[PDB]
Amino acid sequence: EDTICIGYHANNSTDTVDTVLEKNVTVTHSVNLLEDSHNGKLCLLKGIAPLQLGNCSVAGWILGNPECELLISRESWSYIVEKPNPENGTCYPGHFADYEELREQLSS
């Protein structure tokens, strides 16, 4: 004869969480809060370009190393780009005091 029942949703899904009372806990729908990924690119802010040094040091950039493009046209930019191990330090070596401080002052 006739019958009424409750009902609710399930699916084929197997996305999972951890939870206080059980782990790998399966649900239908989820949402990843995290941005676990990176595009592996050096994009630019907002339409504002960054500064690039290529191979140069900050010393080779600021001082006028001819192997470093001076780039007076670069009036302002989004952020500074280097490599970790910059090639072209000073062709005539010498101490460069407060390198840190000048970097932080030229942070922006």
């Binding site: 399930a10 969480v17 990924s37 990176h38 050096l42």
Partner: protein, 53 residues
């Protein structure tokens, strides 16, 4: 590599989607950015449990 693409947050490992609150990816960032953790994952539930029978 350097690219013409645009962003709102950036790090050496890549340019970053500034939509979400968090990464676990690398602490160093510049811009309108997430915050770093030392973790694998964070996934809030929207739905609920799945059991067929």
């Amino acid at each position: 590599p350097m690219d013409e693409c645009d962003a709102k947050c950036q790090t050496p490992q890549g340019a970053i989607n500034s939509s979400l609150p968090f990464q676990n990816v690398h602490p160093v960032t510049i811009g309108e950015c997430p915050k770093y953790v030392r973790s694998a994952k964070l996934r809030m539930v929207t739905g609920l449990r799945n059991i067929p029978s």
